Design a protein around this nucleic acid. Structure first.
Lengths: 203, 192, 99, 193
RNA sequence: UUGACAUUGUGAAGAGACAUAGAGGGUGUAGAAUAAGUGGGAGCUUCGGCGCCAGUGAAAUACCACUACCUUUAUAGUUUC
RNA sequence: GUUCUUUGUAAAGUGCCUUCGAAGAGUCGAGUUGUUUGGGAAUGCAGCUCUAAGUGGGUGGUAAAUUCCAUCUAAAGCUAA
RNA sequence: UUGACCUCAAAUCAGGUAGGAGUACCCGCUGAACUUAAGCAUAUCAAUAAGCGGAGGAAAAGAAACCAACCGGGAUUGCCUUAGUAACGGCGAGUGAAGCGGCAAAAGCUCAAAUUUGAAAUCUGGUACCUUCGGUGCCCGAGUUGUAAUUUGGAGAGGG
């Protein structure tokens, strides 16, 4: 309703008036741990258009990880082959540190069902992506009125899916030229299309 | 927020409180105006079964429910239609982002907003737990003089302090052990 | 654009006698109204401006309208937004120190 | 080392296509099965024809001529100017398109007319049971073939009054290009106040 | 191992060198002189001042320029102190 | 093909005129680095600084800018054969 | 000198949930060597072998910020064709996608962005009753930081 005024609010948090409030936002995010218990959402605008109902189910988590890349536990470079392929620190990851906010609390989500996710505040050491979950074994969810697909075996448990809301956040898998790469997947988008299908009735 | 260091110019109203001399008559004024509870409304439906349902009189043979206005972070029709009078502010306010634009929804339209602290007791006269504002558009003649009188009080204690507050920041509040050495240092530095 | 009706050469297309009814439903996202210019005249006036734009409002009028645009150009990342953001600042200054 | 004057093969050879080649030895397998589902799962299950009357749409581009293609519906504008609504067409069997409409005149004067030879040929059975059977047809897609409308016949008299063509189209292509060149100097000449 | 921005607020902050332009001194022997290594000597508003005015003599005093700048100020500001 | 019930002064859909037209908030774009690919001077994925608009933005296999037109309505989910 | 709301906790109860094997096919993330090589790096092999986790009973993808410059186009994948010409590679060995046409299989839908304001109508839990992949009544909690009904880019909502 009155979320139209919240739409304008974007860079006002960094302006010379609410810039002090920016630290107050990331304040509680670091004071708490990784896995804990939360209550009512802090942002009624974002945690709403992803699926909302004033009852007992829609919550907002608070996961805290590092900020950067990843280095594989190899004995100071167990690889070491080609000078271009080499570089244990040059291997600055490639394709996953965004679902991380769910990929670890997915064990805490395997017993539930992740709805969507978003962002609130960050620094230069940690990451804070608040994720909303919905309990699928809850009778209020199994019935309700709108949603009637939660009962059916549908979801992939958004922590090993790769097709999360934070995963479909990117992943251009449309139909155009910029979407012909991962249109099928990784193997079938190459192993299959490059296969000379030879029937019985050969030419 | 408004105890330790500086305060944001967009707010600077949490340090200001209302006296118990005016707030007393304010709470008692909203006492007579409250919707019926769930325990005294569902049973009432069985009483009007032979007057409204079988009586064929939708909202005809029923007294006017003079209910006080309300709404905080969800106000749309009370601005475009100019139906906002007495406006109150919440106490705790967990969303920090949902308080920096509350006085702006009354200053632009010239709506007499009142900086008050509390919404829990006013949540009892609305059959809930938390409340918000309490304006009156269709008030009776019983409390007509008890409503216009408070208008001149709010406008001379809240409406006159907005532009001046917005300019200045706000601070100078003493801390704790910090002022037990800092203030004692300047005393010996000037006149030992 | 006056088609040819025959083989290609000068014009492009065919003489289509369309009835040109109702097109799409979202050509003009912005307009006058009393709500679109009600939020910015209530929310934007609170915070005012941003720290990186408080310096750009002292380069357009002072250092002319050439190099000042280049400063905001690299500040954003493109020049396509130098007429949708910088141009908007012309109405901000006039609604501040002027009025 | 050197293949001399021979066409060097650059296909999927060097790779391990020993177990990669997905051979398909079906065709007739899924044939009969689907046909056992066309005479049962489509005939003795929900007594309705599969291939309904598809909208005769054309296949453009100069690369292909005298072609013929089908669609997914008759839009909403064609249904509105037919006789019934859009929501009512979803109950009968009339195909309805989506996400947009059409603006062409030839399209409107081809699909709407065809619906007149379909809607007036069938009726609507009541929802209160009954609904007698009068031997229906399980083929509405390939019932009324529509080819390309021929213009004038092969008996046109000799008409000429300055054809040129080869000289006209040559200057037409030049005029298409030389637009921001000829008019460029002309605009800078008429501005001489 | 090193550096800028951001993470990370605030401007009451001791002392310098700059990003466009107009004065200030150019003093070694002799010539009462500011003749600064080199170039330019028929000239710019023309009624009028100096055009090469005197003694001395390697260089002689308006004139769009490669120029080393002893010491200041300077409009919206200033990467590291 | 039958028997047994009144949902309902109800619900849904369609036409014309006046007053109108909301659209997700560190997301898109751009720049640097790594990996991958068929895409030719930045296609997809991951991380970081700067950092979007309301008569708007983006794409349509060759970057950018000025004067016109123009296949869409994303950053959310579910969905037979 | 004395009672409430929000946030943060603690059991062995009615009513629920979590930790894996097999695993064709398929999907997300991370990550090698050998063969060929007019010496070596780039590149090919290879968005690979092996290994791990989750979901489904087909999976991924897909009902348009897509594909065209024509006779405007009518959802995804796969077989045939487009298609071995361009591109990428010490232009060497190699890798090599998509659009038009044609064929088989079709019926599509909805949250926030939106206050009934002159009667908190729906959903969850417990008891009783009953026709138990459910319904009615009474008594709580969640719920003024606004739920529910209506509506989905093809327009839709609010009046006469």
């Amino acid at each position: 309703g009155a979320y139209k005024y919240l739409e304008e609010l974007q860079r006002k948090k960094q302006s010379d008036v609410l810039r002090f409030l920016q630290r107050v936002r990331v304040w509680e995010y670091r004071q708490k741990n990784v896995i804990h218990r939360a209550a009512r959402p802090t942002r009624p605008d974002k945690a709403r258009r992803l699926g909302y109902k004033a009852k007992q189910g829609f919550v907002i988590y608070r996961v805290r990880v590092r900020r950067g890349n990843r280095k594989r536990p190899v004995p100071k470079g167990a690889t070491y082959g080609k000078p271009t392929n080499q570089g244990v620190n040059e291997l600055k990851y490639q394709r996953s540190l965004r679902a991380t906010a769910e990929e670890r609390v997915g064990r805490r989500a395997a017993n539930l069902r992740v709805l969507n996710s978003y962002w609130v505040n960050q620094d230069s050491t940690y990451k804070y992506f608040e994720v909303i979950l919905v309990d699928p074994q809850h009778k209020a969810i199994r019935r309700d009125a709108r949603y009637n697909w939660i009962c059916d075996p549908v979801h992939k448990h958004r922590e090993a899916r790769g097709l999360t809301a934070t995963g479909k956040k990117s992943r251009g898998i449309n139909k155009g030229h910029k979407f012909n790469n991962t249109k099928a997947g990784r193997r079938k988008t190459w192993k299959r299309q490059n296969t000379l299908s030879l029937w019985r009735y050969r030419k | 927020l408004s105890i330790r260091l500086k305060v944001p110019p967009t707010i600077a109203q949490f340090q200001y409180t209302l006296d118990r001399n005016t707030a007393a008559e304010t709470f008692k004024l909203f006492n007579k105006y409250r919707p019926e509870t769930a325990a005294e409304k569902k049973e009432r439906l069985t009483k009007e079964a032979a007057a409204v349902a079988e009586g064929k009189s939708k909202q005809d043979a029923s007294p006017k429910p003079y209910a006080v206005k309300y709404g905080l972070n969800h106000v749309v029709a009370l601005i475009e239609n100019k139906k906002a009078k007495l406006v109150l502010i919440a106490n705790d306010v967990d969303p920090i982002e949902l308080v920096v634009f509350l006085p702006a929804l009354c200053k632009k339209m010239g709506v007499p907003y009142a900086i008050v602290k509390g919404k829990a007791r006013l949540g009892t006269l609305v059959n809930q737990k938390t409340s918000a504002v309490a304006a009156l558009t269709e008030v009776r003649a019983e409390d007509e003089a008890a409503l216009a009188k408070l208008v001149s009080t709010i406008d001379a204690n809240f409406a006159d302090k907005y532009d001046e507050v917005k300019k200045h920041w706000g601070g100078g509040i003493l801390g704790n052990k910090a002022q037990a050495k800092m203030d004692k240092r300047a005393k010996n530095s000037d006149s030992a | 654009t006056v088609k040819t009706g025959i083989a290609i050469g000068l014009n492009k297309g065919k003489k289509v006698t369309s009835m040109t009814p109702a097109p799409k439903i979202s050509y003009k996202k912005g307009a006058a109204s009393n709500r679109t210019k009600f939020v910015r005249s209530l929310v934007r006036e609170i915070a005012g401006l941003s720290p990186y734009e408080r310096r750009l409002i002292d380069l357009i009028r002072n250092s002319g309208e050439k190099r000042a645009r280049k400063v905001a150009k690299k500040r954003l990342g493109s020049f396509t937004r130098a007429k949708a953001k910088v141009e908007e600042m012309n109405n901000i200054i006039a609604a501040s120190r002027r009025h | 080392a050197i293949s001399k004057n021979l066409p060097i093969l650059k296909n999927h050879f060097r790779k391990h296509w020993q177990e990669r080649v997905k051979v398909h030895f079906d065709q007739a397998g899924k044939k009969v099965s689907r046909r056992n589902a066309r005479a049962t799962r489509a005939a003795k299950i929900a007594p309705r024809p599969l291939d309904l009357l598809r909208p005769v749409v054309r296949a453009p581009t100069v690369k292909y001529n005298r072609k013929v293609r089908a669609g997914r519906g008759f839009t909403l504008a064609e249904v509105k100017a037919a006789g019934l609504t859009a929501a009512y067409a979803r109950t009968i069997g009339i195909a309805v398109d989506h996400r947009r409409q059409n603006r062409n005149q030839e399209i409107f004067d081809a699909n709407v007319q065809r619906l007149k030879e379909y809607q007036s040929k069938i009726i609507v059975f009541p929802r209160n049971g009954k609904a007698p059977e009068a031997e229906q047809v399980l083929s509405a897609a390939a019932t009324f073939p529509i080819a390309q409308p021929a213009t004038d016949v092969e008996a046109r008299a000799v008409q000429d009054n300055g054809e040129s063509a080869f000289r006209t189209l040559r200057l037409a292509r030049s005029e298409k290009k030389f637009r921001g060149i000829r008019e460029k100097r002309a605009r800078e000449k008429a501005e001489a106040e």
